Amino acid sequence: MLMPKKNRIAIYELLFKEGVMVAKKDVHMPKHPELADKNVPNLHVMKAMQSLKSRGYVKEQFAWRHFYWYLTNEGIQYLRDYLHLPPEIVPATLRR
C-alpha cells in the first residue's frame, strides 16, 4: 500500500462530509475531478476503497464506471475511531 498518510485522512474526511463517494474506474486518469484541491491518482483511491471493502465497513455498488460506497453506522464508528474524532457531529446525509 504505497500511499501517504494525508491522503487517507483527506479521503476519510471527504467521506464524512458526503456519505457516499463516486469514482471513475480507470487507471489512466491521475487528475481526480471530485477531489481537485489535492492531486491524487484514482488508482490508489480505488485500492484503498477495495481495502476497506475487504475490511467490511462499507457497501459496494456499480454503475458502469461508478463505484458507490454506502456506509454503515458501525463503519461510521470505525472511521471516527480512525480519525479519533468525537461523535458529536452527525453526518450531513443524516441531517434532513
Binding site: H28, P30, W64, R65
Partner: protein, 55 residues
Amino acid sequence: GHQQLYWSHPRKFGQGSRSCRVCSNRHGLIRKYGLNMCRQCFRQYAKDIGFIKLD
C-alpha cells in the same frame, strides 16, 4: 519514474482514447451526435431513450 513512464503513450486521437459510455469497448462505436456507444448496448438502450421505429 513510473509516473512519467505511465503516460508514455499520449491519448489524444484514435480509438485508444475513445470508448463506450455503457460497456467500455473499442469496436463499432457510434459517433452520431456524440452517443459514444457500441451497437448492441445502443440496441438494448434504444427503447428507453424515446424512440419508435417507423420506416
